Amino acid sequence: LTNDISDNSGLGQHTTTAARLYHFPHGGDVIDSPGVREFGLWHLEPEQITQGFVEFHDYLGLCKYRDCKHDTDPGCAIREAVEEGKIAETRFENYHRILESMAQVKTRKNFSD
Amino acid sequence: AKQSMKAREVKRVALADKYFAKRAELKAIISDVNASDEDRWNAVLKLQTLPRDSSPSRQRNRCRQTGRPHGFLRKFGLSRIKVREAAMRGEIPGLKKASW
Amino acid sequence: GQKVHPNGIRLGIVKPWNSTWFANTKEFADNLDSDFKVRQYLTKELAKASVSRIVIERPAKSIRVTIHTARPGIVIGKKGEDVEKLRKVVADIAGVPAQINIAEVRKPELDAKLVADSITSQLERRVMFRRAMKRAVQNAMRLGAKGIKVEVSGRLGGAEIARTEWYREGRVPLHTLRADIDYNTSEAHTTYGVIGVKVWIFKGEILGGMA
Amino acid sequence: PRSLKKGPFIDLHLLKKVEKAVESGDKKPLRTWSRRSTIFPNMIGLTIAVHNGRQHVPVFVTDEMVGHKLGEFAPTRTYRGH
Amino acid sequence: ARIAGINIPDHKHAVIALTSIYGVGKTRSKAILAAAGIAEDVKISELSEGQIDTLRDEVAKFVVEGDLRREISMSIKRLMDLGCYRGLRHRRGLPVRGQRTKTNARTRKGPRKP
Amino acid sequence: PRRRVIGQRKILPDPKFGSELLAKFVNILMVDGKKSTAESIVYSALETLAQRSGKSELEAFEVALENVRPTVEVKSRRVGGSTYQVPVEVRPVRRNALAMRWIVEAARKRGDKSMALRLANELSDAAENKGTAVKKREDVHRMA
RNA sequence: GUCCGGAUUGGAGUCUGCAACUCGACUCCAUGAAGUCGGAAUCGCUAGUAAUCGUGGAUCAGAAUGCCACGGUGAAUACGU
Ligand SMILES: [Mg+2]
Ligand SMILES: [Mg+2]
Ligand SMILES: [Mg+2]
Ligand SMILES: [Mg+2]
Ligand SMILES: [Mg+2]
Ligand SMILES: [Mg+2]
Ligand SMILES: [Mg+2]
Ligand SMILES: [Mg+2]
Ligand SMILES: [Mg+2]
Ligand SMILES: [Zn+2]
């Protein structure tokens, strides 16, 4: 059986430190992976994050400013879209905060290509 | 460039000079006022029978040392490159770096 | 960074042109073409006469060519025979009555063209380059030169990565227009590749303008 | 426009072909490359296979096409959208 | 006032108020005026009908208003009917006279679309 | 100027009143080097201003700009390491230019069909501490 | 949205060139979009400068809003690091 330790206080241990394939009983395969803390995305370009949110294609090209950062730029379609509840507010805020997170982790001069 | 291009140029000029007189007379007949439109018609038909590479407007000034079809300078007959070598070496008479 | 051609910038101040004829724009280009091909023909034909410069001056009905060689007796051959031959040849190329009047260079070690082509001739004979350049500079300044800089660039000693090697001795003040700095460039084609040499030879400030 | 003092333009190989076609009756579509020639009144009702640069497209000349160049009926670019 | 054609000219210098009609511009307007003899700086108001009818008579000579609109529509429809290159670019809604279409062809393509 | 605090050059008096301030005014009002248009505008505005204010049109211009000249203004400083506003006094030569600049922009905003009129109307309201030119001066004083 | 703006389009032309359909420049008549000073952000410039007004040249049969040059008018500001 895979190692299983219970979490203590705020967060759990890192029991599985490996990535192992397993043959599914019916058909196919699964893979157990080690737990992760930060799935930050500084390697991804900022536009690739707008593409990643699937609920945003419904509003590309609907912003009067073409280079619409969509935060407070006038005419940001997804701004009003989330104003009326078409978009999940939490998703919009998460998009913004991961963008600003990329600014914090762009300090490294190492390359990721 | 490719020897093919220089050969093309020399052929174009050697045909333009040949058919110069005929082309000039024919264009005269064409554009000439008072010309009988049948004569003008025969002239405009005959004109396109001559080798198309006889029209001087069909040539291209190439560098007379490399054949480069760009950066040409009529005063010297060289591309924008070889003029600089000839100048800096003191081959173009009275040519020097300008400053004002 | 890059540096302006030293000979090309001192034409107004201390360096004379090498083709001093005059012609208006009507026949300027073909004059240049003719003199280019004639001087290239002469270079190809006098690859052993050790010519330094081929100055060309045209009278209205004639072409006059002055050769600067270190071996006058060579180019004139026997009883001025071959010089008359090549005079006929330049008459052919220019299509114009020609006259050839050779001129000698007394200090062949004080001619950037001469020493540069000698360096290249040594390189193509597969000799260690450092020896070549340092011998050249030593000879030059032994003949009383105010300064000399030699520079070689390319696959020196058949190097996989091309390097740049220079050697200066004396004074070589490129920025001073008043300076008599003779400069020329030569190339040597070896099995590894083409090696470029540049020679600056400063022979003293020329006080008192062009004349 | 070409001019009026020079009249319309046509290259005489096409002219000979078209006259030999009309004088001889109904003919197979004329296979020509001359996009530069202009449609004359006599070639009405003919069918010209004019080169688009990769193929000779058929064009059935009507009296409305008179006073126009042949190339105007052989598009040289294929496009559908994105 | 009233002039030939459905449109009513406003009260301003005749040469200018005459341009209101779809078929007449600045040069044709002053031509009409000179033919009718009325000066340019006159206004359409304070202008007796005795010359208004003359104005409408002289504007009747040229094609103007609706008849011109139908004539241009027939010409574009004919162009499209030939199947000529211009006809294609007309039914496609694109620059007809060889303009660059890689960029800034907006006047015929309308606003940017996603 | 990091190294050399260069001195300002001199302007030439105006050929109608020999007044350095008038010449500075027309230089500020000028557009695209069209000095003649500016001088036409300024002389027209000054003369109509004279008509409303009676005598001494050049003096009327002086007291007009006086009624709106600024004494104290906010200034930015990064010495703290963060943007820091500070109220500071203004040298006479600089507040002259500030008053002239505020007058001309206000006139352009006025509209009403002519620059000559806009300038005159703004000057006339400035002469009596009004026209919103004083209000802009008052707000930047309040920001002390 | 004008006696602003000139795009676009119809009609009719001129010229160069063997040849202006794709794909030239220009003229005339007609047509008269958007545009009413431009978000965050960002660029140039310290004086005959910026800004504005024209003129010329190279290339070139033809084809400059580009480039390289020429003059006309001609400012504002600089406490300070
Ligand atoms: Mg670090
Ligand atoms: Mg070759
Ligand atoms: Mg050409
Ligand atoms: Mg340089
Ligand atoms: Mg018009
Ligand atoms: Mg207008
Ligand atoms: Mg309008
Ligand atoms: Mg308005
Ligand atoms: Mg200028
Ligand atoms: Zn947006």
Angle of CA points F11, F17, F19, to nearest 5°: 35
Task: Determine the protein residue whose CA lies at the shortest distance from the C1' of G72.
Answer: F33
Q: Which pair of tokens denotes residue F126? A: 């400035």
Establish if A61 touches chain E: CB-CB under 8 angstroms.
Answer: yes
The answer to whether F45 and F52 have CB atoms below 8 angstroms apart is no
φ/ψ of residue E106, rounded to 5: -70, -35
Q: Which pair of tokens denotes residue C150? A: 């030699």
How large is the angle between the packed helices F115-127 and F57-66, nearest 10 degrees?
70
Q: Which pair of tokens denotes residue F71? A: 């004494």
Q: Which pair of tokens denotes residue E59? A: 């504007």
φ/ψ of residue B87, rounded to 5: -65, -60
Query: Between the CA atoms of B49, B52, B56 and B62, what dihedral angle is there, to the nearest 10 degrees?
Result: -160
d(CA A67, CA A60): 11
E20 CA distance to ligand 7 centroid (A)?
10
Please state whether at least 3 CB pairs lie below 8 Å between chains B and D: yes
Q: How far is E87 from chain D (nearest CA, A)?
A: 9
Contacts of D66 (CB under 8 A, 6+ apart): D39, D40, D41, D44
Give the three-state DSSP class for C188.
strand
CA-to-C1' span, F140 to G16 (A): 66
- In chain F, the largest separation of any two C-alpha atoms, in whole Å, equals 54
Nucleotide nearest to F36 (CA to C1'): G73
- DSSP state for residue A71 in the 8-state scheme: S
Q: Which pair of tokens denotes residue C115? A: 């020493």
Q: Which of residues 24-43 of F touch strand G (CB under 7 A)?
A: 24, 27-28, 30-36
- DSSP state for residue E7 in the 8-state scheme: P
Report residue E33 CA to chain centroid gap.
17
Strands D30-32 and D47-51: parallel
CATH assignment of E2-65?
A: 1.10.8.50
d(CA F58, CA F49): 9
d(CA C89, CA C45): 11
d(CA E90, CA E74): 13
| Amino acid, single-letter form, for residue C34 | S
Residues of E in contact with A62 (CB under 8 A): 114
Tell which strand G nucleotides have any atom below 7 Å from a protein Cβ: 3, 7-11, 13-25, 28-33, 39-40, 47, 50-52, 58-61, 70, 72-81
D54 touches strand G (CB under 7 A): no
* Nearest partner of C19 among C55, C43, C54, C53, judged by Cα: C55
Phi-psi region of E15 (alpha: psi -120 to 50; beta: other; left: phi over 0): alpha
Domain range annotation of chain B: 1-90
Q: Provide the H-helix boundaries in chain B.
A: 3-31, 37-47, 82-88
CB contact (8 A) between residue D68 and residue E84: yes
Nucleotide nearest to E41 (CA to C1'): G3
As a residue count, chain B comes to: 100
d(CA F92, CA F98): 10
The answer to whether C141 and C169 have CB atoms below 8 angstroms apart is yes
d(CA A19, CA A31): 7
Give the three-state DSSP class for E33.
helix
CB contact (8 A) between residue D68 and residue E81: no
Establish if E61 touches chain A: CB-CB under 8 angstroms.
Answer: no
Residue in the block written with tokens 């004396």: C170
Q: How far is CA D40 from CA C105, D8, D26, in A?
A: 78, 9, 17
Q: How far is CA A80 from CA A69, A88, C22, C90, C158, in A?
A: 14, 12, 78, 85, 69
Domain range for D59: 1-82
Nucleotide nearest to E27 (CA to C1'): G29
Burial of F18 (0-12, 13-18, 19+ CB in 10 A): exposed
The answer to whether B63 and B72 have CB atoms below 8 angstroms apart is yes
Closest chain D residue to B28, measured at CA: D6
Count the domains in chain D: 1
How large is the angle between the packed helices F57-66 and F20-29, nearest 10 degrees?
70
CA-to-C1' span, A79 to G30 (A): 47
Contacts of B36 (CB under 8 A, 6+ apart): none
d(CA B61, CA B79): 9
Query: For the stretch B33-50, what's the b/e string if a residue is b when 16 or more beta carbons lie within 10 angstroms of its beta carbon?
Result: eeeeeeebeebbeebeee
Establish if E110 touches chain A: CB-CB under 8 angstroms.
Answer: no
E24 CA distance to ligand 5 centroid (A)?
10
The answer to whether B54 and B16 have CB atoms below 8 angstroms apart is yes
The answer to whether C13 and C209 have CB atoms below 8 angstroms apart is yes
CA-to-C1' span, B55 to G59 (A): 20
Tell me which chains share at least 3 CB pairs under 8 Å with chain E: A, D
Report residue F66 CA to chain centroid gap.
9
Burial of C138 (0-12, 13-18, 19+ CB in 10 A): middle
Domain range for C91: 16-106
Which is it for the CA torsion C35, C37, C38, C40, positive or negative? positive
D2 touches strand G (CB under 7 A): yes
The answer to whether D32 and D70 have CB atoms below 8 angstroms apart is yes
Instruction: Establish, for the pair of chains A and E, how many residue pairs have beta carbons separated by less than 8 Å.
Output: 6
Residues of D in contact with E79 (CB under 8 A): none
d(CA C146, CA C173): 10
Q: Which of residues 20-39 of D touch strand G (CB under 7 A)?
A: 35-36
The answer to whether F63 and F127 have CB atoms below 8 angstroms apart is yes
As a residue count, chain E comes to: 114
φ/ψ of residue C184, rounded to 5: -150, 160
d(CA E62, CA E40): 19
Residue C138 resides in a domain: yes
Please state whether at least 3 CB pairs lie below 8 Å between chains A and E: yes
Which residues lie across from A30 on neighbouring strands? A22
* Nearest partner of E39 among E29, E25, E53, judged by Cα: E29
d(CA B60, CA B72): 10
Q: Which pair of tokens denotes residue E101? A: 């279409």
d(CA B36, CA B42): 10
Closest chain D residue to E80, measured at CA: D73
* Nearest partner of C21 among C67, C54, C52, C60, judged by Cα: C60
C39 CA distance to ligand 1 centroid (A)?
63
The answer to whether C151 and C165 have CB atoms below 8 angstroms apart is yes
d(CA F74, CA F139): 11
The answer to whether A13 and A7 have CB atoms below 8 angstroms apart is yes
Q: Which pair of tokens denotes residue F1? A: 């100027």
Which contiguous run of DSSP H or E holds residue A60? none
The answer to whether C147 and C170 have CB atoms below 8 angstroms apart is yes
Angle of CA points C7, C13, C14, to nearest 5°: 60
- DSSP state for residue A11 in the 8-state scheme: B
Single residue among C90, C106, C122 that ends a domain in this structure: C106
Give the three-state DSSP class for C63.
strand
Nucleotide nearest to A70 (CA to C1'): G40
Q: Which of residues 88-107 of F touch strand G (CB under 7 A)?
A: 94, 97
Residue D4 neighbours by CB distance under 10 Å:
7
- With an 8 Å Cβ cutoff, the interface of chain E facing chain D consists of 78, 81-86, 88
φ/ψ of residue C158, rounded to 5: 60, 35
Q: Please, how many CA atoms are within 13 Å of residue A39, restricted to the half-sphere of its CB? A: 3
CB contact (8 A) between residue D64 and residue E86: no
Structure solved using which method? cryo-EM
d(CA F15, CA F26): 12
Strands D56-60 and C103-104: unpaired
Residue C153 resides in a domain: yes
Q: Which pair of tokens denotes residue F142? A: 């309040």
Ligand nearest to the CA of A58: 10
Residue A44 neighbours by CB distance under 10 Å:
14
Q: How far is A34 from chain E (nearest CA, A)?
A: 41
d(CA E74, CA E80): 10
* Nearest partner of A80 among A104, A65, A63, judged by Cα: A63
Strands F84-89 and F72-77: antiparallel
d(CA E12, CA B56): 58
* Nearest partner of E15 among E2, E27, E5, judged by Cα: E27
Count the domains in chain C: 2
Ligand nearest to the CA of B68: 2
Residues of A in contact with E114 (CB under 8 A): 60-62
Which residues lie across from F75 on neighbouring strands? F86
d(CA F24, CA F90): 18
d(CA F57, CA F50): 5
d(CA C5, CA B90): 11
Residue C112 resides in a domain: yes
d(CA C175, CA C20): 26
d(CA A8, CA A14): 11
Burial of F71 (0-12, 13-18, 19+ CB in 10 A): exposed
* Nearest partner of C195 among C80, C116, C82, C139, judged by Cα: C116
Single residue among C73, C106, C139 that ends a domain in this structure: C106
Tell me whether residue A14 is annotated as binding: no
Burial of A12 (0-12, 13-18, 19+ CB in 10 A): exposed
Nucleotide nearest to F2 (CA to C1'): G81
Establish if E97 touches chain A: CB-CB under 8 angstroms.
Answer: no
Which is it for the CA torsion F87, F89, F91, F96, positive or negative? positive
B42 touches strand G (CB under 7 A): no
Contacts of B14 (CB under 8 A, 6+ apart): none
The answer to whether E9 and E20 have CB atoms below 8 angstroms apart is yes
Please check whether residues C84 and C154 belong to one and the same domain. no
Contacts of C68 (CB under 8 A, 6+ apart): C51, C52, C53, C54, C55, C103, C104, C105, C111
